[PDB]
Amino acid sequence: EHLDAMQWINGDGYLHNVFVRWFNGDVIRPKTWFWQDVKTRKILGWRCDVSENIDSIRLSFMDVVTRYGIPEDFHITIDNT
DNA sequence: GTTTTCGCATTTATCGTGAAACGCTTTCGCGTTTTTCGTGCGCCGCTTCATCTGATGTGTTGTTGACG
């Protein structure tokens, strides 16, 4: 089948090796979740935070659908294999 | 009078010189040649991501408690 841009997006996380002093003063290693268009490989959105949790995923998704919209056939992949 | 030597003349030979000629080797000059050197890109293979980061021992100082 033919894959359109925005038709299939993959979500992935990343743990940073950089020490950052956050807004609350604590020095932590940030974790960022990214949404990527599978066809073009363009990163469509991200959210960074102090730990891995659903909020960054949810909000980065919000950023993606607010900026580029929701396609009529929408596939989302998060590989938990 | 006949022959032989002696004095003078003309022609040819050659030198010493000076400027020039040729012929050999040496270079440089320029057009076309040959190698080396950089800059440049594309391909292939290896490796990590699909989840990744900090301590100990001894000395000195500060604070707090006890004692005078």
Residue A79 annotated as part of some ligand binding site: yes
> What are all long-range contacts of A36-39, with beta carbons under 8 Å and residues at least 24 apart?
A36/A9, A36/A10, A36/A11, A36/A12, A37/A5, A37/A6, A37/A8, A37/A9, A38/A3, A38/A7, A38/A8, A38/A9, A38/A10, A38/A77, A39/A3, A39/A4, A39/A5, A39/A7, A39/A8
Nucleotide in closest CA–C1' contact with A12: B50
**Protein-contacted positions of strand B (CB under 7 Å):** 50-54
Nearest nucleotide to the CA of A52, by C1', is: B51
